[PDB]
Amino acid sequence: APRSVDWREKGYVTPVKNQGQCGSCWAFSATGALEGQMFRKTGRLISLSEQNLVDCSGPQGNEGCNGGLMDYAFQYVQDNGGLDSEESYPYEATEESCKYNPKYSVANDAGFVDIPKQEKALMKAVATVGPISVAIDAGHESFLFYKEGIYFEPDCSSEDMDHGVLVVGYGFESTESDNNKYWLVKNSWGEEWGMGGYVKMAKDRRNHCGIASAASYPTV
Numbered sequence: 050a051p052r053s054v055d056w057r058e059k060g061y062v063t064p065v066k067n068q069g070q071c072g073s074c075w076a077f078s079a080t081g082a083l084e085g086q087m088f089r090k091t092g093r094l095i096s097l098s099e100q101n102l103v104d105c106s107g108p109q110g111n112e113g114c115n116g117g118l119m120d121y122a123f124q125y126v127q128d129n130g131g132l133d134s135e136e137s138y139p140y141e142a143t144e145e146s147c148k149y150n151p152k153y154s155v156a157n158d159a160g161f162v163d164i165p166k167q168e169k170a171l172m173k174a175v176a177t178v179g180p181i182s183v184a185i186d187a188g189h190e191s192f193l194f195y196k197e198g199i200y201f202e203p204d205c206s207s208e209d210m211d212h213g214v215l216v217v218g219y220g221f222e223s224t225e226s227d228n229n230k231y232w233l234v235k236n237s238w239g240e241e242w243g244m245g246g247y248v249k250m251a252k253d254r255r256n257h258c259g260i261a262s263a264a265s266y267p268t269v
């Protein structure tokens with residue numbers, strides 16, 4: 050597999066978004082992964098509606114601003130037969146009734162794939178498929194104040210993930226500790242967080258923060 054991958058360079062990735070004060074990270078991770086697979090298929094990158102998922106995918110198991118799972122969002126898009134664009138169904142950061150409108154649907158999927166819970170399998174999936182939805186343990190002061198470098202938090206759990214994000218690649222840079230590999234991760238806290246809204250998460254360090262425990266992507 051390649052040593053460095055960055056799907057932003059191949060057109061698969063929209064700009065960083067900001068979920069506000071709604072617990073909808075799962076919806077931003079899911080739209081990011083589906084933005085990437087829709088682009089793979091059609092060659093057109095269209096920003097997709099997180100609000101659509103927040104308001105409407107409750108029947109698949111999601112709980113709006115109180116949390117959800119990317120696989121439930123992928124299920125919704127399939128069950129529902131579509132997903133509206135960001136421009137047509139903009140983000141309000143609050144749960145409201147479902148206003149999905151099929152005329153404005155710009156994406157679909159036929160299910161999803163759950164990646165084996167190993168960083169080796171995550172790597173192979175990122176290298177071949179595109180951006181991948183993942184869950185991580187983001188509950189640490191260090192994650193809030195991240196600015197640059199390879200994020201490593203010794204108290205990070207590999208089974209208790211609380212936060213959905215999007216792996217858009219991986220790479221390496223020399224470091225003091227010679228733990229040089231990272232996942233390139235798009236967050237949903239705006240551009241002012243981290244490195245333009247991205248974080249380099251430690252890679253091949255015992256599934257740091259559980260990034261490989263709940264990884265998946267939609268089938269397009």
Ligand SMILES: *[C@@](O)(C(=O)NCc1ccccn1)[C@H](CCC)NC(=O)[C@H](CC(C)C)NC(=O)OCc1ccccc1
Pocket residue numbers: 068069070071072073074075110111112114115116117118119183184185210211212213263
């Ligand atoms: C996500 O981390 C998030 O949105 N973080 C920022 C934020 C802003 C405002 C309030 C809270 N958080 C989000 C927060 C939890 C509310 N995390 C999730 O939704 C996670 C994601 C998974 C992949 C780990 N899911 C979650 O907590 O699911 C709860 C749940 C319980 C039962 C059934 C379905 C979902």
